[PDB]
Tab-separated table of C-alpha atoms (C1' of nucleotides) in Angstrom:
chain	number	residue	atom	x	y	z
A	5	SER	CA	2.439	-1.907	24.593
A	6	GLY	CA	0.581	-5.207	24.351
A	7	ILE	CA	-0.866	-4.573	20.862
A	8	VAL	CA	0.200	-6.009	17.459
A	9	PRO	CA	-0.113	-4.672	13.958
A	10	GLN	CA	-1.818	-7.079	11.613
A	11	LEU	CA	-0.105	-7.079	8.240
A	12	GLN	CA	-2.507	-6.111	5.443
A	13	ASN	CA	-0.633	-6.054	2.174
A	14	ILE	CA	2.868	-6.923	0.981
A	15	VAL	CA	4.143	-5.706	-2.365
A	16	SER	CA	7.043	-7.702	-3.725
A	17	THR	CA	8.745	-7.966	-7.046
A	18	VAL	CA	10.550	-10.783	-8.846
A	19	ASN	CA	12.343	-11.372	-12.155
A	20	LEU	CA	11.130	-14.073	-14.525
A	21	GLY	CA	14.287	-13.636	-16.504
A	22	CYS	CA	12.906	-13.718	-20.080
A	23	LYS	CA	11.190	-10.981	-22.108
A	24	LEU	CA	7.451	-11.691	-22.104
A	25	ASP	CA	4.896	-10.986	-24.792
A	26	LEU	CA	2.038	-9.297	-23.046
A	27	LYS	CA	-0.550	-9.304	-25.795
A	28	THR	CA	0.040	-13.012	-26.119
A	29	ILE	CA	-0.290	-13.368	-22.360
A	30	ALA	CA	-3.339	-11.064	-22.347
A	31	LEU	CA	-5.118	-13.139	-24.970
A	32	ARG	CA	-4.542	-16.504	-23.323
A	33	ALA	CA	-4.279	-16.155	-19.513
A	34	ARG	CA	-7.924	-15.032	-19.529
A	35	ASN	CA	-8.122	-13.772	-15.965
A	36	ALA	CA	-5.888	-10.985	-17.279
A	37	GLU	CA	-6.465	-7.269	-18.047
A	38	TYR	CA	-4.278	-5.343	-20.477
A	39	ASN	CA	-4.145	-1.960	-22.167
A	40	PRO	CA	-0.652	-0.608	-22.988
A	41	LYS	CA	-2.367	2.769	-23.420
A	42	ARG	CA	-3.086	3.201	-19.737
A	43	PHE	CA	-0.114	1.181	-18.453
A	44	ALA	CA	2.473	-1.232	-19.868
A	45	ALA	CA	1.811	-4.479	-18.006
A	46	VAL	CA	-0.855	-7.175	-17.943
A	47	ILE	CA	-2.765	-7.219	-14.708
A	48	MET	CA	-3.472	-10.802	-13.691
A	49	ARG	CA	-5.028	-12.194	-10.575
A	50	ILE	CA	-5.165	-15.547	-8.752
A	51	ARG	CA	-7.592	-16.708	-6.073
A	52	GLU	CA	-4.940	-18.183	-3.776
A	53	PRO	CA	-2.948	-16.607	-2.560
A	54	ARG	CA	-5.606	-13.983	-3.335
A	55	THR	CA	-3.431	-11.397	-5.093
A	56	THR	CA	-2.966	-9.226	-8.181
A	57	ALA	CA	0.066	-8.870	-10.332
A	58	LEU	CA	1.429	-6.457	-12.854
A	59	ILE	CA	3.281	-8.503	-15.463
A	60	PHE	CA	5.957	-6.744	-17.470
A	61	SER	CA	7.314	-7.312	-20.953
A	62	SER	CA	10.773	-7.012	-19.374
A	63	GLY	CA	10.304	-10.232	-17.426
A	64	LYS	CA	10.153	-8.217	-14.241
A	65	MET	CA	6.953	-8.500	-12.233
A	66	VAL	CA	5.287	-6.876	-9.215
A	67	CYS	CA	2.970	-8.771	-6.897
A	68	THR	CA	0.434	-7.015	-4.608
A	69	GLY	CA	-2.393	-8.178	-2.384
A	70	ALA	CA	-0.825	-10.733	-0.014
A	71	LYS	CA	-0.890	-10.449	3.736
A	72	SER	CA	2.284	-12.221	4.627
A	73	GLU	CA	5.791	-12.462	3.374
A	74	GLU	CA	5.106	-15.998	2.223
A	75	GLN	CA	1.649	-15.695	0.719
A	76	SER	CA	3.232	-13.075	-1.489
A	77	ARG	CA	6.191	-15.188	-2.331
A	78	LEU	CA	3.918	-18.096	-3.238
A	79	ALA	CA	1.561	-16.014	-5.372
A	80	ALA	CA	4.740	-14.688	-6.967
A	81	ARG	CA	5.654	-18.290	-7.842
A	82	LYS	CA	2.223	-19.271	-9.138
A	83	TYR	CA	2.104	-16.228	-11.512
A	84	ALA	CA	5.604	-17.178	-12.588
A	85	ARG	CA	4.344	-20.692	-13.364
A	86	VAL	CA	1.208	-19.377	-15.083
A	87	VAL	CA	3.415	-17.599	-17.615
A	88	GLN	CA	5.696	-20.659	-17.679
A	89	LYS	CA	2.865	-22.851	-18.957
A	90	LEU	CA	1.818	-20.220	-21.512
A	91	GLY	CA	5.139	-20.654	-23.316
A	92	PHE	CA	8.132	-18.723	-21.870
A	93	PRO	CA	11.250	-19.657	-19.646
A	94	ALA	CA	9.825	-18.508	-16.299
A	95	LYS	CA	12.671	-18.353	-13.871
A	96	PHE	CA	12.271	-16.825	-10.367
A	97	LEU	CA	15.299	-14.652	-9.913
A	98	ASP	CA	15.751	-11.929	-7.327
A	99	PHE	CA	12.568	-12.109	-5.289
A	100	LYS	CA	12.300	-9.193	-2.810
A	101	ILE	CA	9.680	-7.679	-0.511
A	102	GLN	CA	9.337	-3.984	-1.518
A	103	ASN	CA	6.529	-2.822	0.743
A	104	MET	CA	4.549	-4.138	3.659
A	105	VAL	CA	1.516	-2.460	5.253
A	106	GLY	CA	0.059	-3.083	8.671
A	107	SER	CA	-2.798	-1.815	10.798
A	108	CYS	CA	-4.002	-2.062	14.388
A	109	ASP	CA	-6.193	-0.322	16.929
A	110	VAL	CA	-4.840	1.652	19.888
A	111	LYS	CA	-8.327	1.359	21.369
A	112	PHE	CA	-9.127	5.021	22.175
A	113	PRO	CA	-9.658	8.402	20.541
A	114	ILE	CA	-6.787	10.759	19.765
A	115	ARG	CA	-6.846	14.510	19.510
A	116	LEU	CA	-4.926	14.805	16.257
A	117	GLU	CA	-4.821	18.597	16.770
A	118	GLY	CA	-2.171	18.412	19.513
A	119	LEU	CA	0.024	15.602	18.131
A	120	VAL	CA	0.379	17.748	15.055
A	121	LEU	CA	1.734	20.516	17.201
A	122	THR	CA	4.026	18.817	19.684
A	123	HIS	CA	5.365	16.843	16.699
A	124	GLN	CA	5.200	19.176	13.649
A	125	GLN	CA	8.542	18.084	12.215
A	126	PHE	CA	7.051	14.600	11.876
A	127	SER	CA	3.348	15.146	11.372
A	128	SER	CA	1.123	16.610	8.604
A	129	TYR	CA	-2.606	17.182	9.134
A	130	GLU	CA	-5.067	18.901	6.868
A	131	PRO	CA	-8.275	17.129	8.104
A	132	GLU	CA	-10.374	18.644	5.341
A	133	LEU	CA	-8.270	17.219	2.496
A	134	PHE	CA	-7.962	13.855	4.357
A	135	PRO	CA	-8.866	12.936	7.959
A	136	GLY	CA	-5.682	11.271	9.061
A	137	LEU	CA	-2.458	12.576	10.554
A	138	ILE	CA	0.378	11.533	8.266
A	139	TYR	CA	3.206	10.659	10.695
A	140	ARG	CA	6.443	10.256	8.829
A	141	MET	CA	8.539	8.445	11.460
A	142	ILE	CA	12.292	8.319	10.871
A	143	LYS	CA	13.489	5.294	12.881
A	144	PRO	CA	12.501	2.929	11.366
A	145	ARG	CA	11.604	4.736	8.173
A	146	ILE	CA	7.852	4.119	8.471
A	147	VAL	CA	4.970	6.454	7.581
A	148	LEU	CA	1.946	5.989	9.818
A	149	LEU	CA	-1.547	7.280	9.086
A	150	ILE	CA	-3.028	8.077	12.544
A	151	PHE	CA	-6.809	8.601	12.761
A	152	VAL	CA	-9.208	10.114	15.308
A	153	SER	CA	-10.489	6.718	16.593
A	154	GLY	CA	-7.148	5.207	17.318
A	155	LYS	CA	-6.912	3.137	14.151
A	156	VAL	CA	-3.290	3.318	12.993
A	157	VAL	CA	-1.775	2.174	9.681
A	158	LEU	CA	1.995	1.607	9.412
A	159	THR	CA	3.430	1.535	5.913
A	160	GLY	CA	6.545	1.636	3.745
A	161	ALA	CA	8.170	-1.354	5.503
A	162	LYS	CA	10.610	-3.859	3.987
A	163	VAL	CA	10.407	-6.043	7.014
A	164	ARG	CA	7.737	-6.970	9.452
A	165	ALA	CA	10.088	-5.831	12.241
A	166	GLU	CA	9.949	-2.192	11.078
A	167	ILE	CA	6.209	-2.179	11.521
A	168	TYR	CA	6.493	-3.674	15.020
A	169	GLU	CA	9.246	-1.128	15.917
A	170	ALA	CA	7.314	1.750	14.383
A	171	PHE	CA	4.165	1.016	16.363
A	172	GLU	CA	5.958	0.479	19.638
A	173	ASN	CA	7.540	3.833	19.045
A	174	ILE	CA	4.321	5.694	18.212
A	175	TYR	CA	2.254	4.055	20.961
A	176	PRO	CA	3.245	5.929	24.123
A	177	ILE	CA	3.169	9.102	22.065
A	178	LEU	CA	-0.388	8.266	20.912
A	179	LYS	CA	-1.452	7.233	24.399
A	180	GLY	CA	-0.504	10.794	25.394
A	181	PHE	CA	-2.993	12.459	23.058
A	182	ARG	CA	-6.081	10.623	24.200
A	183	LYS	CA	-9.102	12.618	23.064
A	184	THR	CA	-10.466	14.250	26.247
B	1	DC	C1'	-16.197	7.611	-5.037
B	2	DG	C1'	-12.115	11.321	-4.694
B	3	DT	C1'	-8.795	12.702	-0.988
B	4	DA	C1'	-3.969	10.707	0.887
B	5	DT	C1'	0.474	6.910	1.994
B	6	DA	C1'	4.515	3.548	0.668
B	7	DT	C1'	6.552	0.897	-3.104
B	8	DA	C1'	8.349	-1.603	-7.378
B	9	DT	C1'	7.388	-2.231	-12.365
B	10	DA	C1'	7.637	1.183	-17.183
B	11	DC	C1'	8.563	5.244	-20.078
B	12	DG	C1'	8.138	9.091	-23.457
C	1	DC	C1'	4.001	13.043	-14.522
C	2	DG	C1'	0.336	10.159	-16.155
C	3	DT	C1'	-1.178	5.870	-15.723
C	4	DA	C1'	-1.701	0.941	-12.865
C	5	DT	C1'	-1.963	-2.077	-8.580
C	6	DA	C1'	-3.457	-3.389	-3.032
C	7	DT	C1'	-4.650	-2.265	1.643
C	8	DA	C1'	-6.352	-0.360	6.276
C	9	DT	C1'	-8.548	4.157	7.411
C	10	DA	C1'	-12.216	8.006	7.464
C	11	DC	C1'	-14.592	12.142	4.951
C	12	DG	C1'	-17.450	15.292	2.295
DNA sequence: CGTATATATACG
DNA sequence: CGTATATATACG
């Protein structure tokens, strides 16, 4: 197909293995945000790897923002350390990449209207509610948002390879719905 | 901006 | 389910 999705976000989780005290953390980490009313975790953000993290009282933590398996893993480590230095046994157990998002450009318009039809069991398209065809591919289990211009977003991946597979699968199909 | 997608955390 | 988080993408 000659094209390559560029990763755009990676959501990963990890376990610090020690019940945290969020208010404490909220008060001292400073670049934090916290309001157990709206959600039960302290949002915290670093500048490199530029990320954001939801810190949980349970020790568990989610990391979002990254653009590569590693940038995420690193940011995961640095937030782990940040809590470490604030006064708690920050271990780094069970790291795992929960979601990965990617995007690319087929380089041509697509008549969503037909794809929807010839592929109804896979597609969804209510252009007034949202302008993109939600293509829930099955192998690999990747949901793609296909748009009029040819911009495509693959999502719900646990491994970079799923995104590459997914695209390669959807490409020829897309290439066959070139807007007139 | 709200719409809309995947995905883990949490939880009453 | 509400509520929170990131990201490309495009609309009214």
